[PDB]
């Protein structure tokens, strides 16, 4: 019926500890079970959640939230545990900070006194700027004004937690058991079974239950190997939605039956990219047979000309053409970590300012165009010219050619294997097989996670070259650039680098320069455009030095669905505005037509801009 959403999930959640872990595989579940202060409407605005009202002081340093009194904690079986109280938000911050939360960078230098508490300069948590004024009133005091602070509250590190429940659970809080957490969101977790099934049930006593349409959400684990019978399960009526893959063995019959139902998503908040390992130590998944090969590859990835040569030879259209259509491949393309229209800088977009900083860095960037839905980088002649310069400097260091680059892939996901094999075919043909060889290491899902995506330390990452992403956490360009800073960036590990042990290689690469540019940008809090311009300079550094090679965004791909379009929560940042938030999602009996979808998108476009204007003006009513 319209009350049951049935689909698939492909991630491997590892923990429901929403205060210590902020990997999306986990928070995509948590967002339906735990509410924060605010959430997102279907237009992208921030709207009340647990907080029914809020205020900010004139100096922008004090944010006060009023908790609605019918906000309650429930156990997994649905029984009420306790009303949510403002002290639960103080407990959340202290627990997340005392246990070195993965997401600690979002609050460490923003909440007043928190950095002094973290470093041990002052161990009195009463001096930290989070307080419970009474049971319904929580107050955050900041180190500096942050217009994006309210957007930060849609991340789970800023979610509340009951202190009595946390202390009695102790070590057993936030495991993979539904009984390891308390529930304050629209749904209860009926069942989780790893690599099998997820089931939600609507919470009848949730304060906003009258807005929750879908009563049951059933997700079955999907490897990504049989891209087919998801469409057959959609035909059966077993599934509410099914992706359609043009490179499947039956797309011909699938297209002619669903010709009027195939719809394409929008580009959303995930920024995808390729990156090098510049400090590889683990060598358990490699086609290299000798030290000379390993020494050669290690020196090559540290050469700027080599990285630019690979960057200019990587055809992003071909990589996207393997999963999506050969025509539809260009829809997903993205050339920056910060979306080019994420912010405006005077009369310029962010991407336009980045390109203006980029052209001043070298003639290899003249004419650069970082717009969406097109490949800014691919250029065979500049790739070959860069590699010729790289080849002459690497031979002086005793580097043998061809260079072997390892890239690890999930063997079971056919999209990833064929995509990485297209990068192999492109890079080997543009640069020459006598100059570079791409060795695609097909690993099991567990194995790939053990040595790449979920590798415990930076020295455990077993590759020379990888494909990863990042989701915006708050409304500021720093959210896409801070993760790669060499002081405390959470994603510094993907380069194989550790902030303490690898400081001379960090300086050798110029990552100290990049970190200082971000620190220089972060000090700008009165002139917001100047702040954006200085983050644009840092984005230009990352593009030019080619440790990161931006590729595409999520979304922009094809599917057939029974989900009524543009009803779910929507956001550019946070965990409360993506396709995993079922609260506002609505289902229909008939399959969505391309006519219905494109008309809804047009009106959603109009109504969102009108709604965003009104919410920006209404927000001034809260400055009291």
């Amino acid at each position: 019926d319209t009350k049951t959403y049935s689909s698939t999930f492909s991630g491997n959640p590892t923990t429901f500890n929403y205060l210590l872990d902020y990997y999306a595989d986990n928070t995509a579940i948590i967002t339906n079970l735990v509410d924060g202060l605010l959430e997102n409407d279907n237009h992208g605005n921030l709207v009340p959640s647990l907080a029914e009202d809020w205020s900010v002081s004139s100096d922008g340093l004090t944010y006060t939230y009023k908790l609605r009194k019918d906000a309650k904690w429930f156990t997994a079986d649905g029984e009420e545990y306790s009303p949510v109280k403002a002290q639960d938000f103080v407990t959340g911050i202290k627990y997340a900070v005392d246990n070195k939360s993965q997401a600690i960078d979002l609050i460490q230098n923003s909440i007043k006194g928190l950095n002094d508490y973290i470093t041990g300069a002052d161990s009195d948590f009463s001096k930290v700027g989070v307080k419970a004024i009474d049971d319904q009133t929580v107050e955050y005091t900041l180190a500096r004004p942050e217009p994006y602070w309210n957007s930060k509250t849609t991340n789970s590190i800023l979610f509340p937690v009951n202190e009595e429940f946390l202390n009695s659970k102790g070590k057993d809080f936030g495991t993979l058991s539904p009984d390891s957490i308390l529930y304050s969101g629209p749904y209860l977790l009926k069942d989780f079974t790893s690599k099998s099934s997820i089931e939600y049930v609507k919470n009848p006593h949730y304060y906003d239950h009258d807005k929750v349409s879908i009563e049951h959400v059933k997700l079955a684990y999907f490897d990504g190997s049989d891209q087919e019978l998801t469409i057959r399960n959609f035909e059966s009526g077993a599934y509410s939605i099914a992706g359609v893959y043009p490179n499947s063995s039956n797309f011909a019959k699938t297209k002619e039956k669903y010709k009027d139902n195939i719809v394409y998503s929008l580009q959303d908040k995930t920024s995808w990219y390729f990156n090098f390992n510049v400090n590889r130590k683990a060598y358990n998944h490699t086609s290299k047979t000798t030290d000379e090969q390993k020494k050669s590859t290690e020196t090559a990835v540290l050469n700027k000309n080599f990285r630019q040569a690979v960057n200019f030879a990587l055809d992003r259209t071909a990589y996207s053409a393997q999963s999506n259509g050969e025509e539809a491949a260009s829809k997903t393309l993205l050339n920056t970590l910060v979306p080019p229209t994420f912010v405006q800088v005077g009369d310029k977009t962010f991407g336009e300012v980045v390109a203006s900083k980029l052209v001043n860095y070298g003639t290899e960037w003249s004419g650069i165009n970082l717009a969406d839905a097109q490949d800014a980088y691919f250029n065979k002649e500049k790739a070959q010219a860069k590699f010729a310069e790289a080849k002459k400097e690497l031979t002086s260091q005793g580097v043998t050619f061809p260079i072997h680059l390892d890239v690890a892939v999930d063997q079971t996901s056919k999209n990833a294997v064929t995509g990485m094999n297209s990068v192999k075919q492109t890079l080997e043909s543009v640069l020459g097989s006598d100059n570079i060889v791409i060795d695609v290491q097909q690993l099991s899902t567990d194995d790939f996670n053990n040595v790449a995506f979920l590798a415990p330390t930076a020295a455990d990452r077993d590759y020379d070259f990888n494909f990863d992403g990042w989701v915006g956490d708050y409304q500021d360009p720093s959210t896409y650039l801070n993760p790669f800073n060499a002081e405390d960036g959470f994603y510094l590990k993907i380069f194989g680098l550790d902030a303490k042990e690898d400081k001379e290689k960090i300086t050798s690469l110029g990552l100290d320069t990049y970190t200082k540019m971000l620190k220089d940008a972060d000090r700008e809090n009165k002139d917001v455009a100047k702040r954006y311009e200085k983050y644009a300079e840092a984005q230009a550094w990352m593009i030019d030095n080619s440790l990161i090679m931006s590729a595409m965004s999520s979304g922009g791909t094809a599917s057939v669905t029974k989900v009524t379009p543009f009803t779910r929560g929507y956001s550019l940042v946070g965990i409360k505005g993506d396709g995993n938030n079922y609260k506002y999602m609505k289902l229909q009996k008939d399959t969505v037509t391309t006519k219905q979808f494109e008309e809804a998108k047009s009106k959603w476009e109009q109504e969102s801009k009108k709604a965003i204007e009104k919410a920006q003006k209404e927000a001034e009513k809260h400055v009291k």
Binding site: S10, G469, F490
Partner: peptide, 6 residues
């Protein structure tokens, strides 16, 4: 934050 399905 780190992405899904990667």
């Amino acid at each position: 934050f780190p992405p899904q399905s990667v």
